[PDB]
Amino acid sequence: MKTPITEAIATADNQGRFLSNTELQAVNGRYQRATASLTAAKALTGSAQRLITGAAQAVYNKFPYTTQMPGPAYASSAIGKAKCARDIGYYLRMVTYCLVVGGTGPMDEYLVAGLEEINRSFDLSPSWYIEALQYIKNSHGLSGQVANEANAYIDYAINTLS
């Protein structure tokens, strides 16, 4: 993972040294930031079912050939629409995990490792998920540093997809 806790432990273990005051401040900075990102994750959890269907509809509006072109990679039939909504739910769930861990630990473990192997083998373009993530970034309704906490982990996934 890449929690600040595990990151601080890994350096001290790699010196073979005890936890100095270097790592304690690194942990303290995670602690006094969590009170903003946990509210972000609580807000994104309750707003989830709206955001998933909204992002899936925005993808079909931006790329209308995805609903009309026949083939297994496209959302032309019902199984394709179900799998597309499943994938958008996966991305939003990984964002909410990274919010409560602190730092992109879960989504490197679950999403991005081996992702373009999947996108090339199952023949699906990464621009669809970028378009879906832009909708969630624009319409989560958060403000202050709560929105700053959400948008960092949104834009991380956008950067790894592009």
């Binding site: 806790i5 595990t6 432990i9 273990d13 073979g16 100095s20 946990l38 995990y97």
Partner: protein
């Protein structure tokens, strides 16, 4: 390795389940005692040399068969191996203390340790004695009120004692 937040994240992932609100309060009260968690590991780190040295000194005062000739601490290098073995456990217990759970203690300290001592001929019960002598030495030091505000941190002290117990039964 995992800390306490990543552990419930792995639980929720392996079930594909969004984190419920009650789990968010369970994590917020771990955030609530962050300064009290940091004070314990700070006090253990500031006394780490005297913990190991006094525990090791009291071990051979009552088990003098180890440092007498033929014992498994009769050298200068087997003795320095013993002191450094005690520092290893004190290091990884303090890692597990700020992690919140014993993944890094179980994973890269205790895994295969009993078999190592069985292969070397080291008496593992005497290692278990020294671990509990460091345990009460660090616990009585973590209940010291110098340099800290007035409050309750007893459940964290029990959590700290649990890691020493887990390391103690893992070595026999």
């Amino acid at each position: 390795m995992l800390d306490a937040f990543a552990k419930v994240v792995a639980q929720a992932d392996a079930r594909g389940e969004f984190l419920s609100n009650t789990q968010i309060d369970a994590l917020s009260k771990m955030v609530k005692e962050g300064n009290q968690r940091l004070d314990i590991v700070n006090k253990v780190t500031s006394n780490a040399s005297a913990i190991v040295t006094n525990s090791a000194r009291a071990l051979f005062a009552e088990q003098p068969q180890l440092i007498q000739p033929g014992g498994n601490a009769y050298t200068s290098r087997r003795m320095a191996a013993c002191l450094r073995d005690m520092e290893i456990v004190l290091r990884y217990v303090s890692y597990a203390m700020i992690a919140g759970d014993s993944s890094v203690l179980d994973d890269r300290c205790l895994n295969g340790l009993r078999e190592t001592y069985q292969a070397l001929g080291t008496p593992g019960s005497s290692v278990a004695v020294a671990i509990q002598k460091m345990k009460d030495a660090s616990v009585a030091l973590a209940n010291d009120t110098t340099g800290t505000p007035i409050g309750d941190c007893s459940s964290l002290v029990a959590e700290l004692a649990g890691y020493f117990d887990r390391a103690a039964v893992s070595v026999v």
